[PDB]
Amino acid sequence: PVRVGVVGAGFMGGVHAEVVAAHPGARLEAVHDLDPAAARDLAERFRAERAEPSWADLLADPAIDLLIITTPNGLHHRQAAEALRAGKHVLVEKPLGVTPEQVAELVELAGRHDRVLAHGSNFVHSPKFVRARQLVADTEAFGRPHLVRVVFRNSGPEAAWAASKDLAGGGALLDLGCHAVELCRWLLDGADVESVSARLQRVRPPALEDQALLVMEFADGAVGQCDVSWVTQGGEQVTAEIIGTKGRVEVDLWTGMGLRAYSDKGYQDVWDPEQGWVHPEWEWIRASGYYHQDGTVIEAVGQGIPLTHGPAEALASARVLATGYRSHAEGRVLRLSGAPVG
Amino acid sequence: PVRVGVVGAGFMGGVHAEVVAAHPGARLEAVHDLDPAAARDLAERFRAERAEPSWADLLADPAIDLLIITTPNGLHHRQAAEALRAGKHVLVEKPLGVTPEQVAELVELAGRHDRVLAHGSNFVHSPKFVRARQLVADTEAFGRPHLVRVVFRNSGPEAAWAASKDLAGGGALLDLGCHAVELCRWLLDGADVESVSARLQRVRPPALEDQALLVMEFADGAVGQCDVSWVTQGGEQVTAEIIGTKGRVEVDLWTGMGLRAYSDKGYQDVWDPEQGWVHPEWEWIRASGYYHQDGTVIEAVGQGIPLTHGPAEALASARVLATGYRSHAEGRVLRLSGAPV
Amino acid sequence: PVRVGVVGAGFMGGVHAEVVAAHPGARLEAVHDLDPAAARDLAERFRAERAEPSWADLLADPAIDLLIITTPNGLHHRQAAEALRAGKHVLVEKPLGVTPEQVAELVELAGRHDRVLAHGSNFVHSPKFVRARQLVADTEAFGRPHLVRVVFRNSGPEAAWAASKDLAGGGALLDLGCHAVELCRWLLDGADVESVSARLQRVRPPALEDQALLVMEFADGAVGQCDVSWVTQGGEQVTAEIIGTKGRVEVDLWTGMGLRAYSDKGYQDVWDPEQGWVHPEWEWIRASGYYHQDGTVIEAVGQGIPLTHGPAEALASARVLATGYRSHAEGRVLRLSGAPVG
Amino acid sequence: PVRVGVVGAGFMGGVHAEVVAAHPGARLEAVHDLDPAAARDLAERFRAERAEPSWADLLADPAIDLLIITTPNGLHHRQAAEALRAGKHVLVEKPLGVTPEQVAELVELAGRHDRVLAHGSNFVHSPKFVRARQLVADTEAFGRPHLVRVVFRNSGPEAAWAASKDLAGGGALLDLGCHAVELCRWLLDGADVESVSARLQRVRPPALEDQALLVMEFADGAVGQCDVSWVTQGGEQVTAEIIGTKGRVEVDLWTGMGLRAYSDKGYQDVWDPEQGWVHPEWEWIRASGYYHQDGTVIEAVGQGIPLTHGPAEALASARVLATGYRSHAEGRVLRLSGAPV
Numbered sequence A, C: 001p002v003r004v005g006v007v008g009a010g011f012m013g014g015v016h017a018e019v020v021a022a023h024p025g026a027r028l029e030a031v032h033d034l035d036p037a038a039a040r041d042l043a044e045r046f047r048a049e050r051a052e053p054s055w056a057d058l059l060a061d062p063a064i065d066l067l068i069i070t071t072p073n074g075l076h077h078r079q080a081a082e083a084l085r086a087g088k089h090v091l092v093e094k095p096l097g098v099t100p101e102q103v104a105e106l107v108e109l110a111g112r113h114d115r116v117l118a119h120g121s122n123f124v125h126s127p128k129f130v131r132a133r134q135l136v137a138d139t140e141a142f143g144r145p146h147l148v149r150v151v152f153r154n155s156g157p158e159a160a161w162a163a164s165k166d167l168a169g170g171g172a173l174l175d176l177g178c179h180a181v182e183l184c185r186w187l188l189d190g191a192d193v194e195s196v197s198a199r200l201q202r203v204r205p206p207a208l209e210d211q212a213l214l215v216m217e218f219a220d221g222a223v224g225q226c227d228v229s230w231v232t233q234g235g236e237q238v239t240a241e242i243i244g245t246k247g248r249v250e251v252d253l254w255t256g257m258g259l260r261a262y263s264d265k266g267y268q269d270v271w272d273p274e275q276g277w278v279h280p281e282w283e284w285i286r287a288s289g290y291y292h293q294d295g296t297v298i299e300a301v302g303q304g305i306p307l308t309h310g311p312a313e314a315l316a317s318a319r320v321l322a323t324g325y326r327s328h329a330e331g332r333v334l335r336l337s338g339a340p341v342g
Numbered sequence B, D: 001p002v003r004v005g006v007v008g009a010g011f012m013g014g015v016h017a018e019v020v021a022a023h024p025g026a027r028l029e030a031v032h033d034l035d036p037a038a039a040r041d042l043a044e045r046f047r048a049e050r051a052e053p054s055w056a057d058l059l060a061d062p063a064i065d066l067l068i069i070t071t072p073n074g075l076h077h078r079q080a081a082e083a084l085r086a087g088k089h090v091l092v093e094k095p096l097g098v099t100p101e102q103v104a105e106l107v108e109l110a111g112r113h114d115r116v117l118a119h120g121s122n123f124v125h126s127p128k129f130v131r132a133r134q135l136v137a138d139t140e141a142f143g144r145p146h147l148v149r150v151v152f153r154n155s156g157p158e159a160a161w162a163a164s165k166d167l168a169g170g171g172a173l174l175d176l177g178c179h180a181v182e183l184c185r186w187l188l189d190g191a192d193v194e195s196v197s198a199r200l201q202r203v204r205p206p207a208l209e210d211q212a213l214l215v216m217e218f219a220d221g222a223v224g225q226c227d228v229s230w231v232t233q234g235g236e237q238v239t240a241e242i243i244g245t246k247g248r249v250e251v252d253l254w255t256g257m258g259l260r261a262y263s264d265k266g267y268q269d270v271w272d273p274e275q276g277w278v279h280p281e282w283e284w285i286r287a288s289g290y291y292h293q294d295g296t297v298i299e300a301v302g303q304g305i306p307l308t309h310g311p312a313e314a315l316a317s318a319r320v321l322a323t324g325y326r327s328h329a330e331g332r333v334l335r336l337s338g339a340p341v
């Protein structure tokens, strides 16, 4: 049974602790947070073997097989490296690193230590996205894909740390674009990126970008748009569409649950908006890919099944994003090398 | 670990066999069918310990804890009774019985043998329906429920046995109305039915009803409509709405997956319609409540946890349907006793 | 140019006055209301030739060709009869009469005086409903219709007069069922009703019914449901569906405008709900059939074109409703004669 | 009464002829086409005073007040100029010109002859778009707009002339982008474009672009996307969304009619797709803005009311598109001057 430690007992510590507690092949062994009280609380909610106040002792404890890192972005690099050196397998929430060189360093490392390194690209394990991908891959029906667009918009992360560059490593392009890039590439069966073009906005007053458009040109001729926002009210939106020479496919995560409700007051267990017509969620964690993702990882560790979707994909997406940042700065379409296309 | 036998290796044998193979607390031990080849097919598909050609030997085998009965409706009664007598726990696909007295007999028989009897009201375990129910139960927001309507329509069951009365026990009202009634009652927290009114149609030519409307009046004042059809082209529809003094809630199972696709041809693993704009399914079996239902039953048998939604609910719905059949015959709104309002 | 008088300058006086003011073949000549100030206001809004304080003088004035009666239901009968006797053509808002015998009396009368009598079944002139009907009539595609359902729900009429039986003539079955029955019959090309079955509710506390289901059996085998409510929050709903042996057709009036908006506050020109996700309206009057309806009537009067959809249809629907009331009272399915089917 | 001539009796000649025949303040006086038979067809369909075989005689006839030009794009410039010189008011289908200089020339020429020149930006007169614009303009509710995206996709124009550069003047970016740009600018109350960035595709084989993305940066900080395609199967899509600091607004023209239908075959007067689930149209011409646009123009000519949306807006959009073509060539974000940001 894969013995698991959660590192950072906030929102995603919580989600991963739920999924782990429910997996018959794993045991939620430990929870650690800089804030010992948040660690104890989460340890009790999901019946963890214990709360570990010490990172040092955590890493030394040979009873742990795997660490799930759900701390702020800027910590991911250092914490994952220490972890892999200590001999633990590691699942890191996105973004795996804050730059391509950070990511590449972790990949090098995991391999040196013969450990599983996985990253939190949960959507790529969302069952409705898995289906979407099979439909685009049905060449008789869909023909050849030529457009893919992934939209990811919300009213922005609440946590204080997501507003500082050192702790967040970036604004909306990094926070949400990682997911969108990775979804475009994967929806097209790991398509090779030839060029990248991006423009960023700062919508909210005085700074990290809170909105972005990034466009990729792929080898096979197709074009990928990633449209990403921290400044969209009205409820999170996660949608994709793919268009081929014969077909079309659309995916809708948050308004594709087939539930609607209306109240004046607001329903007790419905996030936002509260009042009026809403689209309540059912099994949002599963729908979003977290159970399958973590299940894949538990399986990789439990018995050396390499990962369907590996950290090389995180390197690729990191390069895209870094090239996007630079495309914006220079107002130009760019190769991943960084050089202008012309 | 709960050792399981599937009886009837057709479409729902297939579904239950999938759910059982995937449950860590159970083992798919056997598959049996009148057609030994269909049983072997399914046994291999889901890695069943074995294919049992013999009903007799199936029921005698003390390695089996639980039977799932997925045969034609007319057989359910007889098969479930023999099964409970043989000492096995049993989950029967709907409709549990073909009449209220058949259903009552099974419930009481299960009790005699101290067995868990469950029935296949899978939608009552559908996670999106469970969530719809919580929202209607949120009184501050929803207020008091006064209308519930469940719609269940398809182009009708293809199997020959579903067209004959003896093997099917009834037409669309029994086939689909069982689900719809049971959902109206449950969405309103086991609401008491005071009257029943129904009209049936024969749309497709020379006979079992193809289409029906059944309406219930509940104790609290609310009205429930069940609108049910074997003659709707264009893709199955499963749908509910509940309306209160303050709120509204709507549930859409098959066109509420958040997936759409278009092709001229038709996509490989997408049902009907094939061509043009479709609404592909993801995790249909889960979404429909089968995993949670069978899970509930596995749990009841395995670690003696009583069933959340028991077979008395099948008796209640059976009475509603039998009163609906009679309402139609007499052109009158009726009490469950059978007497006219 | 057809010279028009509006009688009752409230909400529907307002709508009809707009449509009339915009019709090149008519002239908004006069507005009359028991409340002379409401008449003057509406006369000014839509540039009416004058405000007429006297019903007597209104009816005697030979400059008026047509009267549009937008007063409370209970007045329709008497006002339309006086009008037709005075020699005026008449368009009466629904329900044309409060009972079948009232309606039959008006039909008799209009014919005696060789006048056009029309009733406010506007939806039957809604362009999206006209299309729906053509699609069901396309027998190759649709086959034979076997189900039609029309749903009509709102949070109920606000006017004081709609709560008293003498002034309203009935509750939700009469107010909304008239529209629904008439839509079912017309969507099926004037289908003959064989039986009627209905059950009514009183949802709001202490009385007129505020919710109803009525079901019709038609000659050709099809079944019609009319589901009608004064107790549905969240915005008016007007939907229909028709199902045949080959086809299906769905119509959505209020959430089929293809406009959506979100705000916290509420948009200035959007009715209800105010806040959160709404479905704003564009050209609601036209979409609802009022321009076409009134246009048909203006044409019938302007040049004796008999009406596509005549007051005989109002008699038929009145009989259905009266039979529905009785079906409810007796708990039985009934023939229009009133006799039980068995 | 405004006496009107239609030039080019194909699809849009047909549409404009319908709108004109129905306007009480105008008279459909003439129809002309290179193909005299197509002109006669259309003249009879909409009861035109006559079919004019001769362009020369058409322009000389002093009974005509206004010409509507619905010929292939390459002809617009020449035909509109001859028309304005002949003393006629003119409405030209998009794209008004094939380049900014062509457009500028016409505007100035119209002025010399004191004529109304309008262009076919019909969607800017679409009642549901007019309403979308009012909601974005409601500052308390919407806040400040920061994103606008207009999507315009179809399976591409069937006419041969639209595949050749000389007759079409451009591919999808010019054909559909003109509409999309003009809608982004107008939905934001005539927002000033500061930069333009675009990438084009050739999806269908050996050439004019089939597909494009064009992005504008506006003065106020907002960003506009125009996503345009000749290679999308499954039915035309026209769609916009605008996102502010507080609100959101979404507009859907072709799948926002509130009509759906299913058949195995296909419904008589329903376009593409034919079979399976479709979204039948009602009043498409009105919904698309043609009646209000032509009404505006009839009014301008008839009773000297200036145009709400004038041809300067066609110049602005033409500059955006020409800068987009150049952006694509150079792989760079560009100012309208042509210079790199």
Ligand SMILES: NC(=O)C1=CN([C@@H]2O[C@H](COP(=O)(O)OP(=O)(O)OC[C@H]3O[C@@H](n4cnc5c(N)ncnc54)[C@H](O)[C@@H]3O)[C@@H](O)[C@H]2O)C=CC1
Pocket (backbone or CB within 6 Å): A007, A008, A009, A010, A011, A012, A013, A032, A033, A034, A035, A038, A069, A070, A071, A072, A073, A075, A093, A094, A095, A120, A122, A159
């Ligand atoms: N895939 C997805 O959908 C999502 C991913 N995330 C990602 O998950 C990660 C965590 O996100 P959340 O929203 O933040 O949870 P958060 O802000 O709720 O929690 C952070 C937790 O980590 C603790 N912490 C901070 N620094 C620490 C350190 N150096 N050592 C140990 N513990 C420390 C804090 O006390 C806190 O309990 C982020 O990388 C974010 O990108 C977040 C939300 C959704």
Ligand SMILES: NC(=O)C1=CN([C@@H]2O[C@H](COP(=O)(O)OP(=O)(O)OC[C@H]3O[C@@H](n4cnc5c(N)ncnc54)[C@H](O)[C@@H]3O)[C@@H](O)[C@H]2O)C=CC1
Pocket (backbone or CB within 6 Å): B007, B008, B009, B010, B011, B012, B013, B032, B033, B034, B035, B038, B069, B070, B071, B072, B073, B075, B093, B094, B095, B120, B122, B159
């Ligand atoms: N939960 C749900 O939504 C649904 C439930 N059902 C129910 O599932 C049950 C089975 O339906 P399907 O699998 O659709 O039909 P099916 O025809 O697809 O399968 C029936 C199987 O039982 C076999 N069989 C017949 N006589 C037998 C006997 N005497 N002993 C053993 N096996 C025999 C048949 O050859 C066939 O293999 C029915 O009661 C139906 O009411 C069906 C569809 C959906």
Ligand SMILES: NC(=O)C1=CN([C@@H]2O[C@H](COP(=O)(O)OP(=O)(O)OC[C@H]3O[C@@H](n4cnc5c(N)ncnc54)[C@H](O)[C@@H]3O)[C@@H](O)[C@H]2O)C=CC1
Pocket (backbone or CB within 6 Å): C007, C008, C009, C010, C011, C012, C013, C032, C033, C034, C035, C038, C069, C070, C071, C072, C073, C075, C093, C094, C095, C120, C122, C159
């Ligand atoms: N087809 C449709 O969608 C609709 C139809 N209606 C119908 O229109 C009619 C009027 O409805 P509204 O909502 O009421 O407007 P309302 O209540 O706003 O106005 C009634 C007006 O008539 C005046 N009035 C009352 N009695 C009068 C009399 N005896 N003589 C002259 N004037 C008198 C009042 O002072 C008032 O101005 C009703 O029959 C109602 O069913 C109403 C709303 C929508």
Ligand SMILES: NC(=O)C1=CN([C@@H]2O[C@H](COP(=O)(O)OP(=O)(O)OC[C@H]3O[C@@H](n4cnc5c(N)ncnc54)[C@H](O)[C@@H]3O)[C@@H](O)[C@H]2O)C=CC1
Pocket (backbone or CB within 6 Å): D007, D008, D009, D010, D011, D012, D013, D032, D033, D034, D035, D038, D069, D070, D071, D072, D073, D075, D093, D094, D095, D120, D122, D159
């Ligand atoms: N507002 C909108 O959304 C749309 C606008 N259009 C525009 O409408 C215009 C016409 O397009 P369609 O009618 O689709 O093409 P079409 O091919 O359907 O019609 C063009 C007509 O002009 C005729 N013609 C060719 N050379 C001629 C000449 N020298 N003199 C007179 N007539 C001649 C052709 O034979 C044909 O009858 C195009 O500029 C296109 O940009 C087209 C589709 C939609």
Ligand SMILES: NC[C@H]1O[C@H](O[C@H]2[C@H](O)[C@@H](O[C@H]3O[C@H](CO)[C@@H](O)[C@H](O)[C@H]3O)[C@H](N)C[C@@H]2N)[C@H](N)[C@@H](O)[C@@H]1O
Pocket (backbone or CB within 6 Å): A011, A094, A154, A156, A157, A175, A176, A179, A236, A271, A272, A288
């Ligand atoms: N308002 C709903 C919800 O907003 C936050 O949580 C949401 C998360 O923020 C949201 O994560 C998205 O947004 C995060 C913030 O931009 C991204 O870092 C992340 O990659 C993305 O998936 C996730 N997919 C849905 C989840 N429900 C917030 N953490 C949660 O407590 C609150 O209840």
Ligand SMILES: NC[C@H]1O[C@H](O[C@H]2[C@H](O)[C@@H](O[C@H]3O[C@H](CO)[C@@H](O)[C@H](O)[C@H]3O)[C@H](N)C[C@@H]2N)[C@H](N)[C@@H](O)[C@@H]1O
Pocket (backbone or CB within 6 Å): C011, C094, C154, C156, C157, C175, C176, C179, C236, C271, C272, C288
């Ligand atoms: N909340 C929107 C609106 O509600 C009332 O007006 C609605 C009308 O009540 C509504 O009429 C429906 O409801 C009326 C009340 O039940 C029925 O008598 C009528 O036959 C039906 O069409 C109409 N189709 C739509 C119209 N917008 C109300 N008169 C109006 O002022 C208010 O602005």
